[PDB]
Amino acid sequence: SHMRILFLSYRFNSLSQRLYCELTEREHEVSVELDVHPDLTVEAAELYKPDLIIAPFLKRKIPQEVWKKYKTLIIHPGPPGDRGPNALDWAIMKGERIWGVTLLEASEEYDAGDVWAYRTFPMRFARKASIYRNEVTEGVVECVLEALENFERGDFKPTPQKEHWWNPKMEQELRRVDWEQDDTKTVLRKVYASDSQPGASSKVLGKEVLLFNAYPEEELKGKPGEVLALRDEAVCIGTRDGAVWITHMRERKKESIKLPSARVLGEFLKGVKEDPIKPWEKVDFKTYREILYEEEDGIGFIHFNFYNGAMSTEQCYRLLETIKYAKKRPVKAIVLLGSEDFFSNGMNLNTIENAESPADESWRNINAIDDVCEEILKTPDKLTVAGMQGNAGFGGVFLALTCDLVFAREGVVLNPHYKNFGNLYGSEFWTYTLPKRVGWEKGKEVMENRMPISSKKAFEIGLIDGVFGKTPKEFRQRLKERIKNFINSKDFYEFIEKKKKERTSGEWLEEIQKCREHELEKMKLNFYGFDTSYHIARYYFVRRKPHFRTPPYLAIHRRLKFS
């Protein structure tokens, strides 16, 4: 009753990773062929001979010789009959109240195959990636699981399409932000529809950029088109009726790096000064707050909204400062909440690659993230909690594991490994935390494994402490109650006195230092040594270079002993 399934993915992205967990944790075998070349895709199908092919994320036609021979199902992020490559972009730009996803057969005509499954859902006014990672992904899981049952039943007939409409690839003239004709609702709509690819073109300070990650501004006003303010490298720009923050941009030039706005504009920003708001301040108006600290019921909650979960060196220090502020407050627990889209993805490879010496910036970034980790570990008199509302990868996973307790929302996917970025040893105290949670035997096993694992699986194997909630609000609410209940019990004071004993002794303190030394000595080699596979992987990832091979850890069918 177990299927052999082949994924064709342009990139092994968040949706492909979630489907991989859902299918393999039901004891199907999934092999992945990245979309490298049509002849390689033909070979992959003939090698693997799947029962079923699923294309979760595809950027071009599947060769007829594949899908005429192997049942091939295609994910389309629009409701049935919707066709074309930017379904979600158009739904956001048109303001569709209701949207959907459709699982359909490959066909000669684009998006014209018979329908196997579909779901619909109400839209949010939100980033396309947010819709994609939540409503679309959850819709797609449901569709795929349904089609797996249908496939194994045996007499299923898909439903041919009836009405159909075509939306083209959306041109940048459509996305383009005109600061004088566009109110804030319109700017948000265009950036949302273009986030996190391909960005909304615009002219800022007479400079051509792509705009990512917008936020409204009810307070500051100014000339439409002028930079009103700076804040944690985000710029505030006047709109036809208000203002809007733009945290990230990139130069409108091929293979340019997406970066915080201040690092793109550069010396166009002489003179513009900061408008800081410390995360523990309260305001009554909508603005942009990267980090937010809020106290409730004896709990200090640290939200940190780092774009794509990447923590640059400076962002790490802002978080370290907020943690240190929280540890001086009269709270029994401190909770790291990340953002709704990501808990954390470790070091910011984009700021690293953009530095004059990526090696040097990697050294600053990994020491800064370790400093955050070490601050959390050295908290003897408070409960520490990591609350993963969204996915976590690389250092981000292990930042969480420094907390006393780790909880994840349902549907969260973890990537608790580094070697996919060419041989990184990793740090973030993983050599102290992972064996403490799971033992070395089980520990080496998961980090040698290079594939994602669900928060459910992480829970089963003891990597995290619980999974619950379907939405971020529901998760935060149930988390707040679990913590509130604990910090008002005997087990809390027992716990704290035991934790105070451990983390004030010189033994534990030097065991902690020696783990950091060991990890950073290996990380020094990754960064400065003869082997440069980390810097090479970084280059292709950050620059969105296409793949030239599928490595064997993804492609079962490209392995030696493969029979």
Numbering used by the authors: -1 to 561
Per the authors:
HypX will catalyze two consecutive reactions, the formyl-group transfer from N10-formyl-THF to CoA and decarbonylation of formyl-CoA, in the N- and C-terminal domains, respectively, to produce CO. The putative catalytic residues, His74, Asp80, and Asp109 in the N-terminal domain and Ty416 and Glu426 in the C-terminal domain, are perfectly conserved among HypX homologs listed in the previous report.
Though the electron density of a part of the pantetheine moiety was not observed clearly, that of the ADP moiety was clearly observed, by which we were able to identify the conformation of CoA in this variant. In this structure, the relative orientation between the adenosine and pantetheine moieties of CoA is different from that in wild-type HypX though the position of the adenosine moiety is the same as wild-type.
